[PDB]
């Protein structure tokens, strides 16, 4: 039962810096995920990236933009030096060597060169529907390859036509990694950029009218903006924790009596949440995108109306309801790589040969 | 020894339509020239294609650009649709009933995909450098797979750095389709894409000024582009249109000479020998392609760039340049048993 993988990074960024978007974060968890099975697993990634122990191949050249120009009629691009393209000339040029390739990049090039491969490739898609030429190449996949698509939720399988041939994998975390905290300080935290048009100024009015202090995680771009958070709601408003690591995080987050996530509704990702509830930390989440997968209402968080501040302080006043060994027994048995591995194993195991 | 050749299309239109340019003539002779010698070709284009006598399979979907867009910088592009990448697509899953693939598009995916196919890919270039992208699409490819690239001039290929490494082929008509005309009206011709910045404007300047009405056929783009020529010029310029190999000949023959004013770089080949084959000298600017065709004084007159009194002159010597020469040069250089040998020299030994 033990098969060989190539994984084959995103070429937006670089693993281990910061700006490989979400599957920056996944793909060492899914790697993970299944060498702890006994899988040998070998990655293929952007020049600039680090990955603890994994053989790791870089390859140089040119980000792939995240762009969407004209829309849904936007075409695929390949610039002069593209990264993504010699990734897939180099990951053909390997492939007798592995049993099976997997794809995290959400690109056209992928999808297209799957019958030029002998060794079957998989596609993990993150996201979205979004543009016509990508969801021409994966229905076109899928007729020839049933199977082949996975994605990490039903909602963003919903948002493709043929969303039911998909299979959902869901998400993990290592949960090794996060520290069950059951005991919490009185306080509130809320993860994100230290940005205008994030939702932190709805998390910080929220705290304080409940009476208690918000620490916040994340980057500082505008020193300005930090002052005028101190004008408009005093100097005990909001307490900056750091941008700060992931060891760091969660030592962090974990004595807090719930995390608060205000975000647009186009940076409403569930990655977050998943790592409060490991921790043992209930949240507090705007009922729509991401979150609504990971929260259990009334038992793990509660799901909020937008911009609504009575809503956020109606829900801050009943995080006591809500037990914090629960939330951590959740993620142990949703978002745990151990689940990951065996939804991998059900997924990629037919399709190998 | 006979063998199997599957030719790909451009993907900027179909066969027929005028889109494609010179690879329209291009790809239906080289085609000829191999199909003489006892090989297969098949052809594989865009839906609305036409192709007398050959096995041609059309396949839909939207076409590539002109790619003029930006400058150097442009990235190579695949809409949704791409009849592109469907070509490509189906030519991968029939490869095995051929020898050889050759590609005649001037675009990245072909030359990227060559290592994905079993099957052999060759790659006849007809535009000088453009991108970077098709710049360095092109020398990976050569840098992997010496001799695999062909150009159809040195001049086009001294526009690559890696130009001596191309194998350049040179250019054939069929001959056959072409008649000689010894006794033409007083008049002038200019042949091909019409649109800005084509030379058009010094044409028509220079025929007038010379007292000569032009004839201009070829695919338009746009009439607002044609009218103003009658009210800065006047006249009838008389447009002939778009018109077939057979149509074209029998026209162009009867003109004193053609015209060719380039702008920038090119305006390499085919029409130049095709207005040989009917017997009518060339009068062009030394740029380009045309050096390398045109015999000076004798089948035409190449003039010092962007002069009207220049073209004027030579209008004017058209007189002393003798019809029967220009198509024995043609018959010499320019026919498809030639073309032939040259073609199996450079494709025969990419063979296994
Ligand atoms: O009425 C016409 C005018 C032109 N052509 C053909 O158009 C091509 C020339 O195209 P162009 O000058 O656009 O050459 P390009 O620069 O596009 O290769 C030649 O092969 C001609 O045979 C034609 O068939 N009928």
Redesign the interface.
């Known amino acids: 039962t033990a098969h060989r993988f190539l994984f084959v990074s995103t070429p937006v960024g670089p693993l281990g810096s910061g700006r490989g978007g979400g599957v920056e974060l996944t793909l060492p968890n899914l790697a993970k995920a299944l060498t702890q099975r006994g899988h040998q697993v070998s990655v293929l990634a952007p020049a600039g990236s680090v990955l603890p122990d994994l053989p790791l191949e870089t390859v140089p050249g040119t980000w792939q933009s995240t762009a969407q120009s004209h829309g849904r009629?936007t075409?695929?691009?390949?610039?002069?030096?593209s990264v993504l393209?010699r990734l897939w000339?180099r990951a053909?040029?390997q492939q007798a060597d592995f049993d099976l390739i997997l794809n995290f990049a959400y690109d056209?090039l992928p999808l297209?060169?799957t019958?030029?491969?002998k060794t079957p490739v998989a596609h993990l898609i993150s996201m979205g529907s979004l543009?016509?030429?990508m969801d021409?190449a994966i229905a076109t996949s899928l007729d020839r390859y049933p199977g082949s698509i996975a994605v990490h939720s039903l909602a963003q399988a919903a948002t493709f036509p043929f969303g039911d041939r998909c299979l959902c994998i869901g998400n993990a975390l290592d949960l090794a990694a996060y520290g069950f905290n059951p005991e919490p300080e009185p306080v509130l935290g809320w993860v994100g950029r230290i940005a205008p048009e994030k939702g932190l100024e709805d998390a910080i009015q929220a705290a304080q009218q409940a009476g208690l202090p918000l620490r916040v995680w994340g980057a500082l771009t505008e020193p300005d903006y930090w002052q005028r958070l101190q004008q408009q709601f005093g100097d005990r408003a909001v307490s900056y924790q750091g941008f700060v690591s992931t060891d760091e995080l969660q030592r962090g987050l974990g004595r807090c009596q719930g995390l608060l996530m205000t975000p647009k509704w186009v940076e409403a990702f569930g990655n977050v949440a998943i790592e409060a509830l490991a921790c043992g930390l209930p949240v507090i989440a705007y009922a729509r995108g991401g979150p609504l997968e990971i929260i259990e209402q009334g038992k793990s968080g509660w799901l909020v109306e937008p911009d609504q501040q009575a809503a956020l302080v109606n829900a801050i006043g009943q995080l006591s309801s809500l037990d914090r060994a629960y939330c951590r027994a959740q993620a142990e048995a949703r978002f745990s790589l151990a689940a990951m591995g065996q939804r991998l194993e059900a997924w990629l195991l037919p399709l190998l040969s």
């Open positions: 009629a075409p695929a691009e390949i610039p002069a030096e393209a000339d053909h040029q056209w297209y060169l019958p030029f491969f543009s016509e030429v021409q």
